[PDB]
Symmetry: C4
Subunit: 177 residues, 4 copies
């Protein structure tokens, strides 16, 4: 099934971050994203795999990161993830069987069921790890998304875009974040 | 645990990893954990009241409390045992119905004041020896959540976090 | 151990000891410094046990000064890279001998401070050549309560562990 | 080989940092470096080994760090690192055989190839680790640069600047960051 993925939907907190919410007096003040995940996001888009974001918490900081990544499909501040999954797939033009999801907590359980393939980050709780198809070995916010994107691209015969200097230079124009 | 109706949590080293992020004006950022926030909401949904106890008051901590809908708290005081009793009275519960989670010496009187106590995984030996249950998770990395899952499970409500259908109700 | 019981002054490095060594920059320099709450309590415990505490940092910033004010630290030498003389100047301000002073560090800059002090501690993530030069290597990483591990050790050595290890023991100094 | 190093080029994110990009609503807001790396950088320069920074991103935060460190050689904003390497070498007046590089991701693969010696931080992926000469034991942003500088200096018989009080003091006038 990894070979047929055309869409990846990722949760944000605890997946693209280590779960920390850095607050100031006004709310989230800083969100910390991982550079290697950003590169994995860019590699998937470059392999014509779309990437969408689902997050129960909306912030202009998350929105900036999304814009920096060139992500156009996403639902922020929405608690019902199963429905958003189906709405995003329709917007992406793909089926659930062509989509993979990566999450870290209970809110993601319906998202795992709606998607054809699911991943849990390494520090997700056991009831989330037990629900997915693959448990990653990397903690959320430490490159788990990248671990998954490398996995998918490898399954699609595209490991050369990240595992040799040459494949890399041939996509570099689209690798920015 | 089945009879816990109120949970009081220290903030620094429990809801955070103990780091105090300063600028020239004092704390500038406080880092919480997303999975603990969900655990807090699960408890409240399960009619278990939640309070925060902290000897550091800051508008940052108050913004986090507001975002989580936490209704009870005592910010600014170093004498936690008294704060425990005053909070129990506000909550309408007895000590045997209240659990506390802490990480340091200042929490010792609070564990003793409460019926049940939890220590985070990186609490010092003397704090760990004083509690009923030592958590396996480090402060600021989901130790409150580890605690709340255990209380809800004990009360027969693990379905609110352990299955998709289970979760889909609330 | 013998020395620990006679400590009356503790001098601490800041980066890599009271912090995990990260320098959080914005375009103007350090923008945030991250300390540990359990260290703050170990510091107050030492002061309450009549053990003076000073900071010795080769970097000076309004952020670090704010942290020192909150902690109630009165003695500090900030902005001097050569720590050997600053250790001595600090002991003079404190009114203590090198033999009555302990230092906690993490890096080569601290080597002269360990030699100047009577007792020395290294954080768990200090490099081998720093761990090999101190009297006691801590098991806690810097920025994660390494100062507290040391203060609990000093207070324990002086028969004052009660101020941190029991509820009753504690309530007296709050 | 370590004995002949005269120039060290270092990637930034994931090497001098732990890889996190700390965002606010306007992009990166904080960059987090490590104090012992900064001392390693000064030790190198003091021991006649120049240091250069290479990053696919440019920011006034990174420039401030570079300025504080006394680093004069850098190439920022360039995503194609192999030619950046030769350009920095030419600025340094040193050859590739006398240059060492430290990186953490796919983008650095061409950089390892262009330098004479290469190092990967401990949390780099397998494909980056397999490509370098030496895999360090320290994670990026936690002193991996310092692990490398210490190794190079020790190889050159200059370990006394970091392993002795007397050696350090002889060079202190140059150890500020
Ligand atoms: Co999440
Ligand atoms: Co605490
Ligand atoms: Co230091
Ligand atoms: Co990098
Ligand atoms: Hg989905
Ligand atoms: Hg209590
Ligand atoms: Hg000293
Ligand atoms: Hg190079």
């Amino acid at each position: 099934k990894l070979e047929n993925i055309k869409f990846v939907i990722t949760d944000v907190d605890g997946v693209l971050t280590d779960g920390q919410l850095h607050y100031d007096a006004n709310g989230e003040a800083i969100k910390s994203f991982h550079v290697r995940d950003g590169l994995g996001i860019k590699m998937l888009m470059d392999a014509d795999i779309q990437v969408a974001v689902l997050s129960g918490r909306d912030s202009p900081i998350l929105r900036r990161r999304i814009a920096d990544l060139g992500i156009k499909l996403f639902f922020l501040g929405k608690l019902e993830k199963e429905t958003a999954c189906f709405d995003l797939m329709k917007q992406a033009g793909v089926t659930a069987e062509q989509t993979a999801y990566i999450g870290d907590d209970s809110v993601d359980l319906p998202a795992f069921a709606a998607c054809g393939t699911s991943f849990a980050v390494a520090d997700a709780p056991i009831y989330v790890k037990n629900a997915v198809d693959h448990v990653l070995s990397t903690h959320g916010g430490k490159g788990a998304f990248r671990e998954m994107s490398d996995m998918i691209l490898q399954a699609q015969g595209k490991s050369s875009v990240f595992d040799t200097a040459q494949g890399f230079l041939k996509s570099v124009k689209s690798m920015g974040q």
